[PDB]
């Protein structure tokens with residue numbers, strides 16, 4: 219039965235169990251993962267509204283100084299580029315990405331999308347022809363199995379993960395791991411089927427719009443936004459589009475029970491429907507640089523294209 | 534069928550017989566790079582371009598004897614493994630060579646039958662492709678996608694005119710988008726016949742997705758020997774970027790007023806949906822790392838055209 223969301227935990231909304239998984243409002247945790255920083259600021263005036271508590275550690279600035287300034291004074295060169303690439307009324311999937319030279323944190327990756335009248339700003343630290351060779355490999359795959367096989371090994375060879383899996387959905391939302399490149403000693407997941415209440419209904423929806431989510435350390439503690447609610451509206455901040463969005467404690471409990479430390483999955487969208495995920499497991503905590511994650515963001519599109527062209531020939 | 538080429542006593546290509554030219558076998562390359570062909574198993578350089586001495590910085594006839602084991606020691610193992618016998622000619626492998634004379638060279642390699650083809654170009658030593666990608670995806674229709682695709686590629690490439698050339702069902706075409714430098718004629722809106730791209734070109738351009746012409750006034754640099762030592766036949770160059778352009782098509786681009794032309798094939802459902810056309814008024818060699826982004830934007834747009842045209846239909 220599809221039911222609507224609870225309030226979050228910070229708006230008096232109940233604690234989650236296995237009975238009511240589909241009612242968690244995962245899109246509004248009011249908190250980011252600690253490996254980066256996140257501001258939200260005004261769409262038009264550039265007024266810095268909220269920030270993650272740890273934004274000082276990362277930006278080498280105090281909140282009182284930060285929040286008492288505009289994005290014009292803070293990001294003088296970037297601000298017009300933000301305005302130009304993210305005009306008003308544009309979709310929240312659209313991101314503008316840039317590099318900074320921040321004196322305290324070194325080179326900083328700035329990712330920015332708009333959510334109504336709210337520019338969400340992310341900050342991460344950031345540090346030869348392997349994707350091109352990967353591109354032509356996938357295309358010259360003879361069939362959907364050799365496509366799936368090369369994608370998973372390519373993805374592993376680029377990223378360095380313990381278990382990379384291409385996971386495919388079925389018509390009734392049941393899934394099954396169709397290919398994997400794994401670490402030597404790890405027990406296979408190849409050909410396991412998994413029930414429909416594993417990736418729940420509110421999750422699969424969000425995963426069709428935004429095509430890359432991750433979890434760095436399944437033992438880390440969510441860094442909360444400050445203030446937790448959006449001053450514009452006095453309502454939760456839509457952090458569904460943010461990659462720094464903290465992962466749910468239901469999900470973190472699960473991954474710890476498997477001996478997993480880090481997780482990454484690229485979505486594969488065919489016909490505007492979630493065809494499958496390129497999931498990645500790691501036994502230790504593992505942060506992937508944003509510039510390297512851009513390579514995987516590309517592979518998701520590339521694979522989504524070939525997935526279709528392969529299935530056209532299977533008929 | 535095709536005629537014999539000019540170098541094997543074939544007829545000259547008038548506008549009458551404009552669909553029987555063997556475009557894939559010109560027996561020559563463009564002067565801004567260097568082509569070597571090599572045997573699959575042994576690795577002996579069977580044929581080279583006459584300008585090879587320039588870019589490879591070696592003597593002319595000394596390279597004919599040597600093997601790719603001796604020449605490219607580190608990459609030679611990778612070429613065999615990455616281009617296995619039986620693979621399609623569309624599968625390319627690429628790497629960067631650090632040569633002693635020419636400096637950073639760009640090696641691109643693909644296999645055809647028993648023979649490998651090795652293309653050497655000069656090459657250089659960031660978030661615009663990511664921003665473009667999302668700019669294509671948030672585009673709310675086909676026309677709004679078409680403007681963003683052309684305007685993207687121009688700002689990346691610095692070309693004087695970037696067009697998007699959509700194909701009607703009977704090989705007729707139309708320009709549905711066109712970013713361009715100020716003070717040029719507008720080809721936005723105009724349609725053109727199906728004689729323009731012949732039957733062989735259209736078929737070849739579905740399999741192979743990027744060609745160019747860096748200089749429309751330069752001369753082709755022939756292969757030596759012209760024919761393939763194995764087969765004593767024409768060397769299939771129809772998957773090489775350094776391949777020379779049909780002399781009709783250069784003679785055309787001069788009458789237009791173009792020094793350098795490039796294109797990217799947008800393929801939807803096995804068929805050729807359209808091309809991304811780039812014109813420059815002057816000669817312009819686009820370097821391999823920048824060209825890679827354009828091939829990338831081809832697949833992206835090929836994907837996005839399918840999503841958008843579903844919303845129309």
Ligand SMILES: *C/C=C1\C(=C\c2[nH]c(/C=C3[NH+]=C(/C=C4\NC(=O)C(C=C)=C4C)C(C)=C\3CCC(=O)O)c(CCC(=O)O)c2C)NC(=O)[C@H]1C
Pocket residue numbers: 235236239242244383385393395407412415416417418421464465466468469472481482483497498
């Ligand atoms: C209470 C309901 C359930 C639940 C909650 C939940 N899951 C996700 C996202 C998931 N779940 C995945 C499940 C798998 N684990 C595996 O080992 C395999 C197969 C190899 C599968 C299919 C996956 C892959 C995801 C996506 C993210 C990831 O790759 O780890 C969420 C959303 C998390 C969020 O913060 O948005 C939630 C709330 N998980 C259950 O397993 C089930 C008991």
Ligand SMILES: *C/C=C1\C(=C\c2[nH]c(/C=C3[NH+]=C(/C=C4\NC(=O)C(C=C)=C4C)C(C)=C\3CCC(=O)O)c(CCC(=O)O)c2C)NC(=O)[C@H]1C
Pocket residue numbers: 547548551554556696698706708720725728729730731734777778779781782785789794795796808810811
């Ligand atoms: C002899 C018969 C004809 C002919 C031959 C021919 N054309 C190509 C490649 C073409 N033709 C194109 C048509 C256009 N040229 C333009 O300037 C525009 C305007 C936007 C169009 C539509 C195009 C786009 C190509 C691809 C490359 C490019 O110019 O961007 C070939 C292939 C040559 C080869 O070596 O592969 C041949 C043989 N063209 C005629 O117009 C007609 C006289």
